Design a protein around this ligand. Structure first.
Ligand code: HEM
Ligand code: HEM
Ligand code: NA
Length: 70
């Protein structure tokens, strides 16, 4: 099935804007961890979600596309 896109909402608008301005996806991915992380606090990944790699950030934007894209 389809994997979920980045919500276009107040929580993610700055990433949409940064992306539109030329920000690299790896730099953006690093900022996602602020909220999307493991216990305690924040927004935990579901069971079975991929875990972070040794080299560089988990590539959020590779699997979770922005909406409004071409
Ligand atoms: C960083 C660029 C980033 C990504 C990528 C990302 C993705 C993401 C997904 C795929 C979801 C699930 C949406 C769904 O189930 O349909 C999701 C949900 C939420 N996020 Fe997020 N997110 C990124 C960054 C951040 C940051 C920095 C925050 C905190 C300010 C944040 C927060 C949230 C919240 C809350 C949700 C729940 C659904 C919603 O209200 O949007 N995300 N994110
Ligand atoms: C990068 C750190 C990253 C974030 C942020 C992120 C978010 C995220 C959320 C919030 C969910 C839950 C969705 C829901 O509530 O229904 C979620 C689930 C899935 N993800 Fe993810 N994800 C990040 C990284 C990655 C990477 C690198 C991949 C692919 C290798 C990936 C894929 C998936 C899949 C599949 C799911 C379940 C289906 C879905 O809900 O989209 N994520 N992710
Ligand atoms: Na990426």
């Amino acid at each position: 099935v389809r994997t979920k896109k980045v919500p276009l909402d107040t929580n993610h608008k700055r990433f949409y804007d940064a992306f539109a301005q030329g920000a690299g996806k790896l730099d953006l991915d690093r900022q996602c961890v602020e909220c999307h992380h493991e216990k305690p606090g924040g927004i935990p990944f579901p069971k079975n979600h991929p875990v972070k790699p040794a080299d560089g950030p988990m590539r959020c934007l590779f699997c979770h596309k922005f909406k409004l894209e071409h």
